[PDB]
Design a protein around this nucleic acid. Structure first.
Ligand code: NA
Length: 177
DNA sequence: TTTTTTTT
């Protein structure tokens, strides 16, 4: 549920007082919302999505994400955390994925969660069956998503990752396949 | 309220 209290609203996004961030009107790729992904090779399976944020239209919400990344580093429970820019949930499509046409001119956000996120159709109805979830949110559609940064400091390294809380269908478009 | 991701 969006039972959150806005702190700051910008074009294509909202920062909430709880530290959650809504990233609005972004293109979806590689959804794993019907069934969790990963944990073939040691890790535990998680639901996930990639969000493609156009650089020309989403600069304000990008700035909020950066600010919140810094805040998350500073507030890490064991003390302020140093994290490399390659170890964040946000990547630069033009640098990191130059051979992927769908990433051209995009910020690329990866968000994951062990608990299945809320999945809403355009009528804001919450979906429950894996098949209906897979049909609704297909790679290439546009969504709005609630995420929240978190700080990782463990045996595998130091990262700022993003919890995936909700995915709302916004627009249909050509599927990536 | 919690915790490795990764392009896949
Ligand atoms: Na459910």
């Amino acid at each position: 549920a969006e039972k959150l209290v806005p702190a700051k609203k910008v074009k294509n996004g909202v920062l909430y007082k709880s530290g959650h961030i809504k990233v609005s009107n972004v293109r979806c790729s590689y959804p794993h919302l019907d069934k969790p992904y990963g944990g073939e090779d040691g890790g535990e399976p998680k639901y996930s999505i990639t969000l493609l944020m156009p650089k020309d239209t989403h600069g304000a919400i990008k700035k909020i994400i950066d600010e919140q990344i810094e805040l998350t580093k500073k507030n890490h429970k064991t003390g302020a955390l140093k994290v490399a820019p390659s170890m964040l949930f946000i990547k630069d499509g033009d640098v990191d994925f130059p051979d992927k046409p769908e990433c051209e001119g995009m910020w690329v956000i990866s968000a994951r969660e062990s608990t299945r996120p809320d999945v809403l159709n355009m009528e804001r109805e919450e979906l429950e069956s894996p098949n209906e979830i897979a049909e609704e949110i297909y790679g290439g559609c546009w969504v709005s998503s609630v995420i929240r940064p978190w700080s990782q400091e463990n045996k595998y390294g130091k990262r700022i990752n993003a919890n995936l809380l909700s995915v709302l269908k916004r627009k249909d478009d050509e599927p990536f396949g």
